[PDB]
Design a protein around this ligand. Structure first.
Ligand code: MG
Ligand code: MG
Ligand code: MG
Ligand code: MG
Ligand code: MG
Ligand code: MG
Lengths: 898, 898
């Protein structure tokens, strides 16, 4: 076996259509051990004075104009990884043409027909070129469509730039790949860092660097450094880094590095620069290509040997063997996949489902466990009923005003509670509070405490810290409560009463958020998390988030498909259970996060296969649950649109996000839904299953037909005193058959093939070929006998009649057999193909019939066929179709279709 | 003018595709003054002993088997009105062929070519027959599709019948039209009475006879009569009548009359049997047909006179004039409409919108005011949050148990509150109450008091009356309240406190339903409405009905289309205002029902044009508001699925209902949505606008082209010494052009034509014809000059070259001009037709080109065309297209497209 040189033979698809993106959150080890050049440059750039920063990157405060931005892009490259730049079209055409098979075909043609027999090798090379341009056009169009689809949903950044010739400055939303060094951008809540940044100004900027430094708590970034110099570049309080997000606050910064020059650009791109292990799709494609190479390299040399030993001329024998082996070439796969999946992707783009990389289309059809969250998917993002009450249950205006202050003076991500509180407060009181209070500091949201705080002041004497969050976390840091207008210590009886009331509200489906306030003396230092102590619990706000009207039918459709929906949510188990009961999902027994830390990996993996609803989950818990759900042969899809959903989305077999979400939840995702709905996801899953079924059918049919032709040639060449068909005719047959098959990506797929999650077995293609090759072979032998005896083509002098006699049988049957071997159901009555496929089949059949009668037949060494041959050909085709229809049942019983 | 004989000429479409159904609720006057035969038969059948009832109608207790049911159907006809039976296909073909135009054409052909010139009139009659069969096939297919669509959503009844050969009896759901006299059916809540019925058994059967007797309160129907004999047939307490609904209770009855033999069957069908005034659609179709008849009868006689005076033979002149006038025949309209609207209807059937009668498709596109209800459309039918509390606000199990008793022991229509109460009660307590309490009597729901009551008993000593309803109505009949476990008199302070609490709950969007209980001594008499007094108010249940997620986008799309959505609801104004604010609708100022009784018709009509939300409306108020909303040139659509929505649905210009609803809300409706959603309605409105635009475009283009041909013939006949074209060639041109236009119903419509509600002006067709006729005449004259001078067709001996020379110009231009005159936008770049239309255009153009060169041309008196004529024809076509494109702008400016 061996066949290491097959690595030369197999051409791999570009690494952007298949396989995921780097996702700069991984490999916490020291790649290149923080290389001294990069570390020194970052350290020097951190404390760089602001004045010479303008000269260093040739940047002006007003921004950059056109000529400058293209000059900078030319000098420093583009804001992309080296694996993200598509090759030029002429390079793609050359690499398509430079394959060993076409070059060897041309060389063999020149050698065989160099004996003054020109216009033969010329036509062979012309056919080779026509096939090459066909493949190149297919691949180029599909790759362009896929790249456009991937660029439709891309992370954007807000830049100063220059508008119009007048030089006016605005705020353009441009894709991150268009960024150049020395570009001024602005950062808000939820926007990821697109490249290395030098902070020009910052208002309470807290960013999440857990991806790089491994610390979950957000860190503060200021305009000027506030710490003595430290070696660690990632700890600089004035430089941002690509791959991190902005938790809260606002900023305006300048790009100091881009593309591969960025910190992550070296990391795992150039610092490691190792060979990435191929994913599931690439492995299957490699298996298919290797199987085709094995079959070709096994059978073609036998044909070569037989023809050389018997016929005579060895060169023509080798040319003929290569021509028949071209049918089973492995370089059709780079087109086929690209020609099929991209089409589905385009169709998915019309179903509000953008596919960033074609590989996902496989997994998106193979998904059988879909982890999600109650918010957005199950229930809406807008809450209908909300009542602001104190601990006694009566409506309290103090609680509503404190919540309004906290929501209005926050700078983090917008929340449904914040919007509801802002809308539910009257304009007069809202403006009175706005003109009466002023913001000072903000303590953002983090999962260690799950509380958000804002410190404001009504004067310069005292400050008020107003915090809000989940009930238990607020109660943990509350010592006093404002009951009946008096501040009374919060004893155990009131705690238990509050707990039972909130438990009843949760059981009714109401989410409860508690609010506390505290008064402190005025101080200059920033407020830390330690300041949330001895608070005064003003009250709690209970709000109802109604389930979506379409959630239950979508869940039913998903269960019908076979996708077991599981809920991984950080909310209370009571609210999650009520929501699941409302939407019809079977909660069963709930598992909280605190009950999985003690459990081992095996125990959690054994419990995750039976539990439907998981509550009170930290992002680490979500990542662990998703990771342990794939081991038992399950393809897992995770749907989320949160800040910390990047590890969960990346760890899942497929990640699905929404167009409106934080950047890190879109960069890490593989599928982007234009709207957050389960019905759209289910329809997209069905259509992706159809697309993958179409691709598999294409590969199966092409391989089976070409292997059957090769087997017929191998078995029947010895007895004949000449070539059964001229290799030029075989190339014509292959080209016309490929042109006919062009329409297969548009075929229809039976609902039986797409009723269950798809499992792809590359070894099934070999069984299909072995089963469906001799079928065609038998009728090839019958046609050979018919031409040898009935039509008296017994001598080479009349061989032209013989070969053409097979040609029309070779092309049409190969074209017709598709309609018999595309469905397990009986064709034309129980299952039908698509109109383009039938049109192409009929047109190609007509062209093949008319080729011997066309004036070109003389140039193609084709002789006209007598009218008596037509009934025999029709009978042969009918017998072939009937036999394959009656034989498909045995293949269905022994091995099965899907 | 006069032209009364045009009534003979115009063929009217069948009265089932256009115009509504009888809807047996109308004309409260005494039609036939209660004819003595029917009244006596009903009176005798009412008190008929049950024993001889079986023999009277040949019915057995087990039901009827097949042979008996077909025998009864043959004897007594079918359960349909005389206007609902479609004619046989051969009758339709004959009536299509029996039109004056085709008969006159055949007679003139025989007269003109009876001078031994056979095979001429024969071919003319063959072409006449081909056109007749084309029209008949189109009409028959479209009518069959429309009838199938109307039968898809039809009121059904549950019948005993016989299942299988074993004789087993089941309960078949069969359409009401299949009912035969002497058939046993069962009646439940919400099922309308399908035909005259004799009640065999009844359990608390209360039916609504407000349609016939005019009394809003439901009346009781018993198995045996309980009143002394009374003359009025409609007051019989044992006979049901078609057109009425079952408010509550169960029954099993026998059909005693069917079809026209039913009480309503005489009423307005045979008792009156008057000429129904045509609706909007029929009037417009009559106007179009009359305009075409006027144009034809004006211009054709002039051509006849000119040709007879100049050419010679009068018979051939009359034949030629009739042949050119055939282009403007008015009997194409019965096909066109039926061929277009039905197609849209079929498409509407794929958008979950079933159209019962094609006429609706006009109004459904012309709708600009859509009256609806908050339940179902705006909000969902399932309530998420519900809390059962007493007057003090604490949760009370007594209130929940009383509501459970009332909901479980009711027999009326199921309600969202009833389902929520049934689901929210634990199984143990529910079964304990079920085994502990037993139903005795029920006082159903009616709008005079808006309260429902059920009288049950735990023993034989005392009975408990449990009633529920709106808060104010319950409080009106409550004197005591169970507060803190003690029965205390309900004073004014508690009333005001309850009112303010419930007002706050309504302002939060919670609907509040109060429940009262009372204890009475055991008695044998039935409980009446007077028993609801001195009740004990147990408490109230507040439940939240969340708005649908898709309501706001659907309302935005409807407003973008131009359909002003108005809400006519009987709920409280606070809840309706909160729902409207939630869904984004502008409530503005609300109008309650009590504030429209004093207002006059003019005042209410001037107020309903500015008010968006109407609250606390009785069904009479809804009917009045809908009636007064159409006078100011507005097409009003009413959407409802209630028992009393039949007057509102019928009084509106169009009525839309849901598949799942009471029967009387489906019989009275014109459109049936498979699901209750506003988005489906908006998409259906858009598609119906497209369909009506397609129909109008078809009529306009056909009339304009044929009028242009007639004008060319009229102007250019005098100078020529022979017929410009043989009438056989004109018939060929008309047939081929119609075959080309067949694909117009499948055309594409610009979004500009369907962006606003459509207004149809029949007089616009005349202006369009006048504008676009001479444009097609100028080039006809140019072609005449080209054939006369350039090609030297100066003598009748070479007239065959001349006529054919026009023929190819006549057919292709008429076919091509469509792509220029179908859109106001520039063709082929800014607006494009549909693939079937382009395919048909190209195919018909090819056929017309090849006809002179075909061997049939000799039989059709067509001569082959020289190759030099092709460039001239191409130039003529290009000039015609360019001139019409440049001229369309003037028509757009002066009159406008839509
Ligand atoms: Mg942003
Ligand atoms: Mg600070
Ligand atoms: Mg073959
Ligand atoms: Mg029913
Ligand atoms: Mg009773
Ligand atoms: Mg014309």
């Amino acid at each position: 076996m061996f066949k290491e040189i097959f690595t030369r033979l197999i051409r791999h698809l570009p690494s952007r259509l298949v396989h995921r993106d780097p996702l700069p959150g991984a490999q916490q080890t020291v790649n290149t051990v923080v290389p001294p050049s990069l570390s020194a440059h970052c350290l020097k750039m951190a404390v760089m004075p602001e004045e010479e920063l303008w000269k260093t990157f040739d940047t002006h405060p007003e921004g950059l104009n056109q000529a400058e931005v293209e000059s900078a892009r030319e000098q420093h490259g583009e804001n992309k990884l080296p694996a993200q730049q598509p090759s030029p079209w002429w390079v793609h055409l050359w690499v398509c043409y430079r394959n060993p098979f076409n070059i060897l075909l041309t060389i063999l043609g020149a050698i065989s027909y160099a004996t003054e027999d020109l216009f033969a090798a010329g036509v062979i090379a012309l056919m080779v070129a026509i096939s090459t341009l066909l493949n190149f056009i297919q691949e180029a169009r599909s790759t362009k469509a896929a790249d456009a689809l991937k660029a439709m949903v891309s992370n954007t950044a807000t830049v100063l730039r220059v508008i119009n010739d007048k030089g006016e400055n605005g705020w353009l939303e441009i894709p991150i790949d268009q960024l150049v060094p020395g570009d001024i951008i602005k950062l808000a809540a939820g926007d990821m860092i697109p490249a290395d940044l030098r902070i020009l100004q910052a208002r309470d900027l807290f960013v999440a660097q857990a991806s790089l430094t491994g610390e979950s708590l957000p860190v503060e970034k200021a305009a000027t450094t506030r710490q003595p110099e430290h070696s660690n570049p990632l700890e600089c309080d004035t430089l941002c880094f690509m791959g991190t997000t902005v938790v809260s606050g606002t900023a305006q910064a300048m790009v100091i590095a881009t593309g591969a020059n960025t910190w992550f650009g070296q990391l795992a791109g150039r610092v490691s620069e190792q060979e990435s292990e191929p994913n599931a799709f690439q492995q299957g494609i490699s298996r298919v290509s290797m199987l085709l190479i094995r079959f070709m390299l096994v059978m073609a040399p036998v044909v070569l040997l037989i023809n050389g030993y018997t016929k005579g001329d060895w060169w023509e024998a080798a040319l003929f063997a290569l021509s028949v082996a071209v049918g089973l070439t492995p370089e059709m796969l780079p087109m086929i996949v690209t020609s099929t999946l991209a089409r589905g992707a385009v169709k998915l783009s019309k179903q509000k489902v953008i596919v960033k990389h074609l590989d996902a289309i496989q997994n998106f059809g193979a998904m059988d466990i879909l982890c999600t969250d109650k918010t957005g998917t199950l229930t809406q993002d807008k809450i209908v009923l909300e009542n602001h009450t104190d601990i006694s249950g009566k409506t309290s205006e103090r609680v509503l005003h404190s919540a309004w202050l906290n929501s209005h003076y926050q700078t983090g991500l917008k929340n449904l509670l914040d919007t509801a509180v802002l809308e539910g407060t009257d304009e007069e009181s809202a403006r009175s509070l706005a003109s009466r209070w002023q913001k000072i500091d903000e303590i953002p949201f983090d999962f260690e405490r799950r509380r958000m705080s804002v410190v404001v002041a009504e004067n310069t004497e005292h400050h008020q810290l107003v915090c809000k969050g989940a009930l238990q976390e607020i109660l943990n840091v509350c010592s006093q409560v404002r009951h009946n207008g008096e501040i009374v210590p919060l004893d155990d009886i009131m705690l238990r009463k509050i707990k039972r009331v909130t438990d009843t509200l949760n059981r009714q489906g109401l989410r409860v958020v508690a609010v506390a306030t505290k008064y402190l003396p005025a101080r200059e230092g920033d407020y830390q998390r330690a300041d949330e102590s001895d608070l005064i619990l003003e009250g709690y706000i209970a709000f109802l988030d109604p389930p979506k009207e379409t959630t239950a039918p979508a869940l039913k459709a998903l269960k019908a498909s076979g996708i077991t929906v599981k809920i991984l949510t950080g909310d209370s188990e009571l609210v999650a259970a009520k929501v699941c009961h409302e939407v019809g999902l079977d909660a069963g027994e709930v598992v909280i996060g605190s009950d999985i830390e003690t459990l081992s990996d095996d125990e959690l993996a054994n419990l995750a296969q039976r539990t439907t609803l998981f509550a009170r989950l930290t992002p680490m818990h979500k990542e662990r649950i998703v990771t342990l759900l794939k081991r038992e042969g399950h393809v897992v899809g995770f749907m989320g649109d949160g800040i910390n959903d990047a590890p969960a989305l990346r760890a899942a077999d497929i990640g699905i996000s929404v167009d409106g979400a934080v950047d890190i939840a879109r960069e890490a995702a593989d599928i982007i839904l234009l709207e957050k709905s389960l019905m759209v996801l289910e329809e997209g899953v069905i259509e992706g299953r159809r697309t993958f079924a179409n691709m598999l059918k294409y590969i199966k049919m092409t391989a089976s037909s070409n292997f059957g032709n090769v087997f017929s040639v191998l078995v029947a060449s010895a007895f004949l005193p000449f070539l059964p068909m001229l290799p030029l005719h075989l190339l014509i047959q292959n080209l016309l058959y490929d042109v006919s098959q062009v329409a297969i990506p548009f075929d229809n797929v039976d609902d039986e093939q797409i009723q269950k999650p798809q499992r792809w077995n590359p070894a099934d293609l070999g069984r299909f070929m072995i089963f469906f090759g001799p079928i065609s072979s038998i009728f090839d032998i019958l046609t050979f006998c018919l031409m040898w005896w009935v039509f008296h083509a017994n001598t080479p002098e009349t061989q032209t009649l013989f070969q053409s006699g097979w040609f029309v049988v070779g092309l049409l049957s190969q074209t017709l057999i598709v309609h018999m071997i595309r469905t397990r159901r009986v064709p034309f009555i129980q299952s039908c193909a698509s109109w383009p496929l039938m049109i192409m089949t009929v047109i190609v059949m007509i062209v093949g019939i008319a080729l011997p009668f066309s004036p070109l037949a003389s140039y193609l060494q084709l002789q006209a066929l007598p009218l008596s041959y037509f009934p025999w050909l029709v009978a042969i085709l009918a017998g072939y179709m009937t036999l394959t229809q009656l034989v498909k049942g045995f293949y269905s019983r022994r091995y099965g279709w899907q």
